[PDB]
Amino acid sequence: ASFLSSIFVPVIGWVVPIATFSFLFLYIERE
Amino acid sequence: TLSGKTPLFAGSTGGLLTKAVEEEKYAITWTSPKAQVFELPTGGAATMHEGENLLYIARKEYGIALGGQLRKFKITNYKIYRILPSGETTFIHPADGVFPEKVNAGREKVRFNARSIGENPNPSQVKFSGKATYD
Amino acid sequence: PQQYGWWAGNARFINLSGRLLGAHIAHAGLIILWAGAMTLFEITKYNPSLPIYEQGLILLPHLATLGFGIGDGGQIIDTYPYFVIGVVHLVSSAVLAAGGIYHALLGPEVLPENNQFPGFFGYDWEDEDKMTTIIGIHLLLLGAGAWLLVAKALFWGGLYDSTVASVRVITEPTVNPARIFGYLFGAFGKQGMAAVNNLEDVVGGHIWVGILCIGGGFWHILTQPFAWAKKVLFWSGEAYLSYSLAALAYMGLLAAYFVTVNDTVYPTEFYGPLGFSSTSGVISVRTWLATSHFALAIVFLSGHIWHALRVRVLEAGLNFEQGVVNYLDTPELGNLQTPINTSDLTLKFLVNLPIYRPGLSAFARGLEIGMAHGYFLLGPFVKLGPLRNTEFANQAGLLATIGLLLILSICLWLYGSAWFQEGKSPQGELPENLKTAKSWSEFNAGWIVGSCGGALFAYLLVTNSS
Amino acid sequence: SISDTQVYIALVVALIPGLLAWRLATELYK
Amino acid sequence: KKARVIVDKDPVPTSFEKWAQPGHFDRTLARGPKTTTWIWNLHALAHDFDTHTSDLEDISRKIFAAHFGHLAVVTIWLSGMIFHGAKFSNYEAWLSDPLNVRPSAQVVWPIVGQDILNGDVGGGFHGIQITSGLFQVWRGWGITNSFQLYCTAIGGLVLAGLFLFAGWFHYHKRAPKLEWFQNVESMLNHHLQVLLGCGSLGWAGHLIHVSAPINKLMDAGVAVKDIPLPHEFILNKSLLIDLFPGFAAGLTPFFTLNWGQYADFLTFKGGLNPVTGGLWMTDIAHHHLAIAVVFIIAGHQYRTNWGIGHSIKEILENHKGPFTGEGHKGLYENLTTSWHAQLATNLAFLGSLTIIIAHHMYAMPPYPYLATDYATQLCIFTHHIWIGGFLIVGGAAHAAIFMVRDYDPVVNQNNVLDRVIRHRDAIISHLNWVCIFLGFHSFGLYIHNDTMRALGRPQDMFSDTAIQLQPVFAQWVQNLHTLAPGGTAPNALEPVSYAFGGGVLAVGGKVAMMPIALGTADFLIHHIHAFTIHVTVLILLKGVLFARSSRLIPDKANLGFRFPCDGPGRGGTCQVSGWDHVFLGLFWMYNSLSIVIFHFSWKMQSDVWGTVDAAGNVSHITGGNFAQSAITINGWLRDFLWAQASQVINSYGSALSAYGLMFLGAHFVWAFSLMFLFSGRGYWQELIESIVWAHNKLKVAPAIQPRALSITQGRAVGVAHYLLGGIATTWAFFHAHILSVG
Numbered sequence A: 001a002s003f004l005s006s007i008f009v010p011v012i013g014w015v016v017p018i019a020t021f022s023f024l025f026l027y028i029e030r031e
Numbered sequence B: 001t002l003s004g005k006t007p008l009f010a011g012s013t014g015g016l017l018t019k020a021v022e023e024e025k026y027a028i029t030w031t032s033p034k035a036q037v038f039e040l041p042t043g044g045a046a047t048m049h050e051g052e053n054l055l056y057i058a059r060k061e062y063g064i065a066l067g068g069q070l071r072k073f074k075i076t077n078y079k080i081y082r083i084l085p086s087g088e089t090t091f092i093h094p095a096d097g098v099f100p101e102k103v104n105a106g107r108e109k110v111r112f113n114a115r116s117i118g119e120n121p122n123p124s125q126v127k128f129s130g131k132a133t134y135d
Numbered sequence C: 001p002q003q004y005g006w007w008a009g010n011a012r013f014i015n016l017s018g019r020l021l022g023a024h025i026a027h028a029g030l031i032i033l034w035a036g037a038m039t040l041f042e043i044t045k046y047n048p049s050l051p052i053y054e055q056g057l058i059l060l061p062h063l064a065t066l067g068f069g070i071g072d073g074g075q076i077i078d079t080y081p082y083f084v085i086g087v088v089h090l091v092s093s094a095v096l097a098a099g100g101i102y103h104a105l106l107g108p109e110v111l112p113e114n115n116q117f118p119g120f121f122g123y124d125w126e127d128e129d130k131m132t133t134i135i136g137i138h139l140l141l142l143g144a145g146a147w148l149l150v151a152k153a154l155f156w157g158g159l160y161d162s163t164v165a166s167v168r169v170i171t172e173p174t175v176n177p178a179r180i181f182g183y184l185f186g187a188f189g190k191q192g193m194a195a196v197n198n199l200e201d202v203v204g205g206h207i208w209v210g211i212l213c214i215g216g217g218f219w220h221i222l223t224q225p226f227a228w229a230k231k232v233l234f235w236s237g238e239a240y241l242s243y244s245l246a247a248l249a250y251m252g253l254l255a256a257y258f259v260t261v262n263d264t265v266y267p268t269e270f271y272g273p274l275g276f277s278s279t280s281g282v283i284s285v286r287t288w289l290a291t292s293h294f295a296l297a298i299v300f301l302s303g304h305i306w307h308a309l310r311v312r313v314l315e316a317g318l319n320f321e322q323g324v325v326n327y328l329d330t331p332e333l334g335n336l337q338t339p340i341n342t343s344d345l346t347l348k349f350l351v352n353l354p355i356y357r358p359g360l361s362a363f364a365r366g367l368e369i370g371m372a373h374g375y376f377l378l379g380p381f382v383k384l385g386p387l388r389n390t391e392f393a394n395q396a397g398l399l400a401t402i403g404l405l406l407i408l409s410i411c412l413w414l415y416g417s418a419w420f421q422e423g424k425s426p427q428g429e430l431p432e433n434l435k436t437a438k439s440w441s442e443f444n445a446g447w448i449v450g451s452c453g454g455a456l457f458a459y460l461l462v463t464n465s466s
Numbered sequence D: 001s002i003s004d005t006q007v008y009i010a011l012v013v014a015l016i017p018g019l020l021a022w023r024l025a026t027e028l029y030k
Numbered sequence E: 001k002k003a004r005v006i007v008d009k010d011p012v013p014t015s016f017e018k019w020a021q022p023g024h025f026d027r028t029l030a031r032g033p034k035t036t037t038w039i040w041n042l043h044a045l046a047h048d049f050d051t052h053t054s055d056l057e058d059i060s061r062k063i064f065a066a067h068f069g070h071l072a073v074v075t076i077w078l079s080g081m082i083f084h085g086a087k088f089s090n091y092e093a094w095l096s097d098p099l100n101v102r103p104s105a106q107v108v109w110p111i112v113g114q115d116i117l118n119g120d121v122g123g124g125f126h127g128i129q130i131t132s133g134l135f136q137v138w139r140g141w142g143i144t145n146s147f148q149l150y151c152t153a154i155g156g157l158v159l160a161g162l163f164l165f166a167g168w169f170h171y172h173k174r175a176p177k178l179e180w181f182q183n184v185e186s187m188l189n190h191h192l193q194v195l196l197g198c199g200s201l202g203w204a205g206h207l208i209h210v211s212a213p214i215n216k217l218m219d220a221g222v223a224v225k226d227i228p229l230p231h232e233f234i235l236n237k238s239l240l241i242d243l244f245p246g247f248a249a250g251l252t253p254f255f256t257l258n259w260g261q262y263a264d265f266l267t268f269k270g271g272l273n274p275v276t277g278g279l280w281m282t283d284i285a286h287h288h289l290a291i292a293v294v295f296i297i298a299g300h301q302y303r304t305n306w307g308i309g310h311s312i313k314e315i316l317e318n319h320k321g322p323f324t325g326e327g328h329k330g331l332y333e334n335l336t337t338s339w340h341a342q343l344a345t346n347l348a349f350l351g352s353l354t355i356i357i358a359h360h361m362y363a364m365p366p367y368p369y370l371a372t373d374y375a376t377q378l379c380i381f382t383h384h385i386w387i388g389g390f391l392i393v394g395g396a397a398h399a400a401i402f403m404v405r406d407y408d409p410v411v412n413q414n415n416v417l418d419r420v421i422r423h424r425d426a427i428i429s430h431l432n433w434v435c436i437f438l439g440f441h442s443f444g445l446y447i448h449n450d451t452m453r454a455l456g457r458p459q460d461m462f463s464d465t466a467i468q469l470q471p472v473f474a475q476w477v478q479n480l481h482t483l484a485p486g487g488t489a490p491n492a493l494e495p496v497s498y499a500f501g502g503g504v505l506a507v508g509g510k511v512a513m514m515p516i517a518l519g520t521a522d523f524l525i526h527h528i529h530a531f532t533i534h535v536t537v538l539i540l541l542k543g544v545l546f547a548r549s550s551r552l553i554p555d556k557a558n559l560g561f562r563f564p565c566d567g568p569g570r571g572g573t574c575q576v577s578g579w580d581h582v583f584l585g586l587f588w589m590y591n592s593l594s595i596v597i598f599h600f601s602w603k604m605q606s607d608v609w610g611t612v613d614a615a616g617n618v619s620h621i622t623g624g625n626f627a628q629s630a631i632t633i634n635g636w637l638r639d640f641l642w643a644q645a646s647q648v649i650n651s652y653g654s655a656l657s658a659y660g661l662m663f664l665g666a667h668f669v670w671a672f673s674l675m676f677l678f679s680g681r682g683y684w685q686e687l688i689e690s691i692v693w694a695h696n697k698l699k700v701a702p703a704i705q706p707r708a709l710s711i712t713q714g715r716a717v718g719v720a721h722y723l724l725g726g727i728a729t730t731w732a733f734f735h736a737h738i739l740s741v742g
């Protein structure tokens, strides 16, 4: 189960920020 | 419609940015009795021409500031124009040809409150309403 | 002419051919005088007990390497060859002196241009053929001079060799192009052309230089300069001077590097130990030659720049009174015109970058930009990453690069998505074919493909460095 | 410690407040 | 026209009337106080003479008289230092034993137990150990007894008296006209030739006739009582001949250009005297002679009354090129009509010079027994760096004051000053960038290193044992200066400084000076200096270039030099004034110089200073920990601040206890400053309202209505206490540490 750390920590570190900042950027610039 | 030659030594990095092309631009015209040096709104010693001068400016505050400096040169015939990207020039100062500090008949009171400032309502009174306490 | 002050007095006869000629023969004479007179000056105070390198004799080392009166172990046994050479120059100086003072003021101010033989020597800075022929004419004499060194190295005695410390005759010159030109490509050492370690490559080098100079000699006298040369170069008389100064500066630095590191063509028995060495407090001949000609190369580079920038200002139709800093034809605009932002070189370069270059599709722009950025971005990740000192240094670096380029691809998609909102075109200095949502998608597709490719290509070159 | 199965159940059970947190957040935005 | 003495007689009648009329000098202040703001304004405007009167002649007279005042107080101070040396010091004991006795010239009175501060300083004397280097100055002067100091002190009090009289006389009695003041060519001639040239010739005289002989005998181990008095070397030539044979030749070799006959008392030795570890007096003699000649020649450049000479206006006007339009035309008028333009220049370059002096004095310790007095070395370096930094920021302030008040567009049209104003956005944008670049690629390397060390990855650090950043250029320059003697300086025996290279020079057991090797820690700290200087310049240059106007406030010159803002509009215009850029530049000057003196302190203690074994092995004060520690912030926190603060925090119940109290006191004053900097006037005026209510309630409300400090004064008080507190902390730290280990 320890292997989940190798999946989740990179996701919370990179995937989640990129996805969140990408969406929020597109939302705050929507006209 | 804007007549006047651009003053000598009018060049600097403090001039018009992309806003002047995209949003809005201002011009200030004035008739000088004599060619004389004046400080530009955004730095640099420019030279007025004898006769009609036209200076493009990013902000209306540049015009009013320069206007104040032209008054020190005994010049009170300066006109500020707002210019839109469609080339819609609008004369904006002095609005009615008379300077705003001088009283002119025809002008109506705008945003006048017929009360002392102490007589404004409390914020609680105008809560969840559209109106503010200074309305 | 008359606008130039006495301090810039030699600029008065730029357009006057006679004075300019007379000045060149006169200065030639001055170089000959020095070469000849200082050879005698050095002969007069040669102590055969003490070595040459710590006496302060510069020309005798240059005569010594040619193998003029030396026995075994680089020992100067006879000095008559130094005297005969010294006097030959010193008399040639007096003949060139005469020629100098004649063409200066006694001769005509302008060399006449006509169909007669005296007419040939006359020239104009605009007629490009006549200068090209003069380039070729004097190139034949550079070739001749290189073949005279070869003849000295092969037939007339030979050259001094530091391997056996004797004056061996050269018989088998290296006529292999791959070997001799390999020096230009840094094949046989990090030092390049200054990494020569035998006379066989030196004679071989001067064969190749000899035939190239003679080959170029025939070319330039029999051909006029083509339309591509007609556009890229400046054609004022001061433009040619600035080019020649760039060459002299390059040659000065070349010889300064040679004398510093090379010991074959500059023997340690004459010039002294390699690098910068001082024996018994006395500075070695090598150090003097190296450091002087390094300093003169920096000065002659400063001369190239000065004379080149002056040409570029004059040809732009700018004077030095109003200057090189102007306004944008609309003074009240932000920017100023400067040689950094408005120079034809700057404008031509920027316009021709893939982002601005006419006739490139949105994809092709992205692709070229991608390839360039993807290529150079590999370096830092490979060579400074956490796995840089492991077997996975290149592979780690490549995956990092692809990684960064994928986030940069998302950044592009975000930038486009933000701006392209049904009709409203993006602000900023875009090309006309990147002002639609589909064109921007193509540009992003271009970037991705380009950047991945550029990275992959750098990786294939890095991993196959063998 | 706890089994790999128990960790996988917890993650699947954690999708429930994950879903409902999304639904509440979207409803609170209106 | 001709330079001549032209004065008005009895321009200002002397009377105590105006002494009884506080704020007489300003028309606004003359009406009297209504609020407590008046009391501040009085002091704030006191010496702002441009606001007193419009007349440039009256301003020039006030400035000339004030200077005689400042010369008088500086002479009183220098006389006091020498008097305290004569009366309340162990100078004579210290002469007999320089290496063992500790210099002290301040004795504390026995009251409330403060006599503890009178520590055992050696020479059977109890007092505060001094770090001003006065003993090393007086030894260099060739002073050998208390009587010579008494004479010098009294002489000073007479000179201070003369300076007071001069200031009163040249204001109240015979005040020069503006014509006099504007003779810049005559002033430069007299100040180059007499003040500097004849001062340096005069001093060469003293060195050659008094200092060199007396010091030579003291270095030969002759007892102070046995050494002849300085006049005995003039009256009895035989004594001087014995030390310097060249005096046998007399003055004829000077007039016949046989100057080699003086090679024994006018030397170019280089390095340091091995006895004292200071520069050779004979080198210093020849220096001051050579300086004197170059100055006396230099000060015949400017035309006065005889046609020969340059006019500075013509020089300036002629220096223009194809980038700079009219070039330096109009700058002569700026510098001869504005006192602020001169004060800007003189503060900028005197400040820059004081920092050069700091560097040159540690590397080439000019005084005998200075190099080994590690307390003096650290303190005079730090002192002169601080004075330098304040003067430079003053330069920028008065440059901005000039731009707001004294700048004329007509004089300065298409000149270098006009043209810098026209690309000020290009200047500040580029300087902004280079500041961020230097910040990332200097400080970011420390953060990289801290993180790598913390993650247990020392191989990934920027260090000598990891990814190296060798300062190859500084390393190459050190080598050139080390090879100079015999090579590119043939007539030099040693290098100018052992810092560049050569050997470790040691006096007593201790290292006077040795080569200061540069590596990754030296590369990193140098790029921190570059960063912190470029950011200070960004702030100050932005202050001067945007003082008159900006894209935000077009009419900023009308608001003046010192105004708090132009209101919360335009998003908020807090601290746009040239004054507020000086305010922000002071913090960055403080930040910059703090890291400079910390760099010096740690580098010298780890890599230079220390004891020398008989074999010749150097044991440094902090055992060369700089290379591995000074490459992380944690290393600075631990091995510098934490480690070396042990002496100051453990000083209570000893003679260094005062530094322990100063250390806390300074930490307090610093923290107190944050009240002024972080808060605003609005809060304090509203609090004062309630306090005023209570005073009104008990009928003790003052007629002079209490006001919260002005927005500008709030900031001025803030930065004052911040600098005082911060600098005083380091001062207490440095002393307590270096008076224990050094």
Ligand code: CLA
Binding pocket: A009, A010, A012, A013, A014, A015, A018, C385, C386, C387, C395, C396, C397, C399, C400, C402, C403, C404, C406, C407
């Ligand atoms: C929060 C989570 C997080 C995680 C899990 C990581 C993980 C990593 N970082 Mg760190 N980093 C982070 C936050 C994070 N970072 C932040 C906030 C900063 C700024 C303070 C940094 C600053 C930093 C620096 C300066 C460096 C790292 C490096 C690394 C790698 C070192 C391991 C190694 O030596 O193998 C070697 C591993 C590789 C060479 C890369 C493996 C493949 C990459 C991760 C992705 C491949 C493409 C991917 C499939 C798709 C696109 C990318 C993305 C959208 C997912 C590792 C992948 C080092 C590195 O190697 O950079 C690339 C490195 O130099 N990080």
Ligand code: CLA
Binding pocket: C377, C380, C381, C384, C385, C386, C387, E440, E441, E442, E443, E444, E445, E447, E448, E451, E460, E461, E467
């Ligand atoms: C700010 C300066 C700074 C610098 C220079 C470095 C440098 C480095 N870091 Mg460190 N780091 C820093 C701050 C810094 N760090 C900070 C603040 C942290 C957070 C605490 C870290 C945390 C960290 C981690 C966790 C790791 C690193 C690592 C590294 C190394 C590899 C990084 C890499 O591959 O990036 C690649 C860089 C680029 C792709 C950008 C290159 C920029 C180019 C060269 C600019 C070119 C401009 C050009 C000259 C101008 C135009 C050219 C013209 C022709 C047009 C490298 C030595 C890694 C390592 O392994 O250490 C050895 C690693 O694992 N760093």
Ligand code: CLA
Binding pocket: E432, E433, E435, E436, E437, E438, E439, E440, E443, E444, E447, E535, E538, E539, E584, E585, E587, E588
């Ligand atoms: C520690 C305290 C601190 C710090 C870090 C800063 C930082 C800065 N100041 Mg400030 N300043 C400070 C105190 C500080 N100041 C105080 C107390 C005052 C009141 C006097 C000021 C007043 C002031 C003025 C008047 C000016 C500055 C300016 C600057 C900037 C200079 C440019 C630079 O170096 O950029 C580089 C950035 C740094 C050195 C910060 C650290 C960088 C880290 C190590 C790298 C990034 C790591 C990583 C990528 C982080 C993100 C990842 C994460 C989100 C996952 C810089 C951002 C100047 C400026 O803006 O000019 C350019 C300027 O003119 N400051």
Ligand SMILES: CC1=C(/C=C/C(C)=C/C=C/C(C)=C/C=C/C=C(C)/C=C/C=C(C)/C=C/C2=C(C)CCCC2(C)C)C(C)(C)CCC1
Binding pocket: C371, C372, C373, C375, C376, C449, C450, C452, C453, C454, C456, C457
């Ligand atoms: C000095 C100078 C300069 C220069 C510099 C630089 C900029 C450098 C860099 C460089 C670089 C930056 C380069 C680059 C290159 C690149 C390359 C060479 C690429 C390649 C690529 C490829 C070939 C690819 C391929 C592919 C693709 C695309 C896709 C698919 C896959 C493949 C692989 C097939 C300039 C001009 C600015 C200016 C003047 C001065």
Ligand SMILES: CC1=C(/C=C/C(C)=C/C=C/C(C)=C/C=C/C=C(C)/C=C/C=C(C)/C=C/C2=C(C)CCCC2(C)C)C(C)(C)CCC1
Binding pocket: E078, E151, E152, E153, E155, E156, E159, E197, E198, E199, E201, E202, E203, E205
């Ligand atoms: C420390 C002090 C002091 C003291 C001081 C003193 C004591 C000083 C002095 C000074 C001096 C004592 C100086 C002098 C000088 C001099 C000079 C500067 C001279 C010059 C000369 C010359 C220049 C010459 C010339 C000539 C002639 C005449 C003839 C022949 C020729 C000739 C050229 C050689 C006092 C008390 C104030 C207090 C404070 C501190």
Ligand SMILES: CC1=C(C/C=C(\C)CCC[C@H](C)CCC[C@H](C)CCCC(C)C)C(=O)c2ccccc2C1=O
Binding pocket: E675, E676, E677, E679, E680, E681, E684, E685, E707, E708, E709, E710, E711, E713, E714, E715
């Ligand atoms: C504390 C603080 C105050 C309050 C401080 C004030 C009003 C200063 C008052 C202190 C002095 C020392 C009062 C002196 C009064 C008498 C002269 C003392 C007479 C008694 C002596 C003779 C002993 C501000 O006004 C302020 C304004 C703007 C920004 C920040 C701040 C800020 O931080």
Ligand code: SF4
Binding pocket: E564, E565, E566, E567, E568, E569, E572, E573, E574, E575, E680, E711
């Ligand atoms: S907060 Fe203070 S400084 Fe800022 S705008 Fe308001 S009054 Fe002015």
